[PDB]
Amino acid sequence: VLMVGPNFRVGKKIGCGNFGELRLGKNLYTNEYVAIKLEPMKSRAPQLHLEYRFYKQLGSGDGIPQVYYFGPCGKYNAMVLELLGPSLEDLFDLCDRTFSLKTVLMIAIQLISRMEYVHSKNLIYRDVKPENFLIGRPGNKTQQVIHIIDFALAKEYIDPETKKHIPYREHKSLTGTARYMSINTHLGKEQSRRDDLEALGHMFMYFLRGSLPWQGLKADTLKERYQKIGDTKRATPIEVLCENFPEMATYLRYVRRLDFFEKPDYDYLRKLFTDLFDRKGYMFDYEYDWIGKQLPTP
Numbered sequence: 487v488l489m490v491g492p493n494f495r496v497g498k499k500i501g502c503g504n505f506g507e508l509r510l511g512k513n514l515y516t517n518e519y520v521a522i523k524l525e526p527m528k529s530r531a532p533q534l535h536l537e538y539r540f541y542k543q544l545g546s547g548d549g550i551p552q553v554y555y556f557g558p559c560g561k562y563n564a565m566v567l568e569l570l571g572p573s574l575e576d577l578f579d580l581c582d583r584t585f586s587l588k589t590v591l592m593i594a595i596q597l598i599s600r601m602e603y604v605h606s607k608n609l610i611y612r613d614v615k616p617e618n619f620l621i622g623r624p625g626n627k628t629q630q631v632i633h634i635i636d637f638a639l640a641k642e643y644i645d646p647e648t649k650k651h652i653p654y655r656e657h658k659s660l661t662g663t664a665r666y667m668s669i670n671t672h673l674g675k676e677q678s679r680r681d682d683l684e685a686l687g688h689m690f691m692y693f694l695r696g697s698l699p700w701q702g703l704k705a706d707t708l709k710e711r712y713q714k715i716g717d718t719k720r721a722t723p724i725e726v727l728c729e730n731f732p733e734m735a736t737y738l739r740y741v742r743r744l745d746f747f748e749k750p751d752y753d754y755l756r757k758l759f760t761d762l763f764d765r766k767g768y769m770f771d772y773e774y775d776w777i778g779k780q781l782p783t784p
């Protein structure tokens with residue numbers, strides 16, 4: 487209908503993909519634009535309410551969009567959240583699908599921290615991809631901040647009653663994004679903190695190279711395609727994938743070698759990147775490759 491909750495006017499379909507799942511909204515009470523995620527109540531695979539619950543568990547955080555409302559909107563459930571800027575994928579395309587090392591480091595430094603924050607709230611993310619990292623909007627003074635969105639695939643990796651890390655197990659069906667997922671995800675292993683960080687590594691390399699070497703693989707079934715991609719990830723030495731980027735190689739073999747239950751040393755990983763960053767004479771000034779270009783809106 488026209489409205490979500492007391493005060494959010496539902497506007498136009500925005501973004502690409504979606505199929506009507508994302509709308510511009512306006513808080514009429516505050517004169518502020520918002521994002522409205524819509525999910526048909528009839529959905530055979532509802533994710534929006536579990537996503538909302540993950541956001542509540544995350545709480546208020548750096549680079550975590552504010553969530554304003556969850557509730558019904560006609561024959562949809564709606565989640566009203568902070569309107570953010572373009573995704574890293576949008577911005578990657580805008581920058582001819584390569585980012586400079588400086589840009590990738592400024593992103594990486596933030597997203598290690600972004601991931602550590604998620605992990606500190608007993609969540610694993612499990613959906614790393616450039617599309618789920620958005621800059622803010624100029625209006626919010628957070629346009630420089632890389633935000634993380636899309637927690638539908640997240641999982642509590644610390645059992646809230648037992649306070650124990652989730653058990654190791656396998657034969658987990660593959661669903662996520664094949665391109666960035668960890669080698670262990672490919673093998674059907676339960677994802678843990680290491681996997682979010684490894685997927686980050688892959689994405690970092692994607693940004694630096696402009697592509698990953700398993701990116702073009704096709705198969706008659708999803709399972710075969712996941713298999714071939716995982717096979718290629720296993721067959722591609724880190725040294726080769728991360729040629730010219732030794733710290734990336736170091737990051738990637740460290741996160742690859744993490745035990746299932748292990749707390750990553752986020753400090754260590756950040757320091758690999760901030761040491762490199764300083765060594766290259768980069769200044770952390772948020773002058774990303776896309777700055778000065780014509781960004782998509784909202």
Ligand SMILES: Nc1[nH+]c(Nc2cccc(Cl)c2)sc1C(=O)c1ccc(F)cc1
Binds near residue numbers: 568
């Ligand atoms: N919080 C925001 N903010 C967004 N801003 C936005 C939307 C379309 C284009 C641009 Cl440039 C920015 S998208 C979004 C979001 O949660 C989202 C992204 C993709 C999607 F399929 C559903 C929701």
Ligand SMILES: [Cl-]
Binds near residue numbers: 599
């Ligand atoms: Cl940060």
Ligand SMILES: [Cl-]
Binds near residue numbers: 767769770
């Ligand atoms: Cl610089």
Ligand SMILES: [Mg+2]
Binds near residue numbers: 547549550551552
């Ligand atoms: Mg905020």
Ligand SMILES: [Mg+2]
Binds near residue numbers: 613636
């Ligand atoms: Mg998604």
